């Protein structure tokens, strides 16, 4: 996905947010600079995108530099973003929290259960060129006993998780 961004001189962050134009920033180990997407637009994008997929940013230089959304600063009251950070990529095994599919139907949907999706985005390392997606896990013999976690998953070689393994991922817990 694309988005028109524009250079900031560093003037009136209040003025820009009131004129529809959410301020943010782009950075990596060679360049950090200041930008202003449009709220209107960014919403369509981030709501579909998030930080599992990748954005690209078309500037007044034709340079559509490729990025990931590091950090989003919310408003606390009347939820509504104030600031976005953009991680400029190239070809280095950088991190990210690739999502998970929960394909299946545990035994705990019949003897009193619900699935709790503890950690439905797990962290990993791999170069920008390689961008996996929905790293499904199957569930079907997970009854109300305890439940699976950490390294028990489907890791495309190139993927090199930065977790434990112990960090819980899901569970089958009782009714009301």
């Amino acid at each position: 996905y694309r988005l028109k961004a524009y250079y900031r001189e560093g003037e009136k962050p209040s003025a820009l947010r009131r004129a529809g134009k959410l301020p943010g920033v782009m950075y990596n180990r060679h360049l950090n600079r200041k930008v202003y997407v449009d709220l209107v637009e960014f919403d369509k994008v981030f709501r579909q995108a998030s930080i599992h997929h990748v954005i690209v940013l078309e500037l007044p230089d034709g340079q559509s530099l490729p990025t990931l959304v590091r950090q989003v600063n919310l408003d606390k009251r009347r939820r509504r973003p104030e600031h976005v950070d953009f991680f400029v990529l190239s070809d280095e095994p950088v991190e990210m929290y690739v999502p998970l599919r929960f394909v299946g139907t545990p035994a705990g949907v019949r003897a009193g259960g619900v699935l709790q999706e503890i950690h439905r985005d797990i962290l990993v390392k791999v170069s920008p060129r390689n961008i996996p997606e929905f790293i499904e896990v199957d569930v079907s013999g997970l009854e109300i006993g305890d439940s699976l976690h950490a390294s028990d998953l489907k890791l495309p070689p190139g993927v090199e998780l930065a977790v434990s393994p112990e960090e819980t991922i899901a569970a089958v817990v009782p009714p009301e």
Partner: peptide, 11 residues
């Protein structure tokens, strides 16, 4: 009431 939007404070 609220849903599950940009509530993603991962990095």
């Amino acid at each position: 009431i609220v849903r599950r939007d940009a509530y993603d404070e991962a990095q």
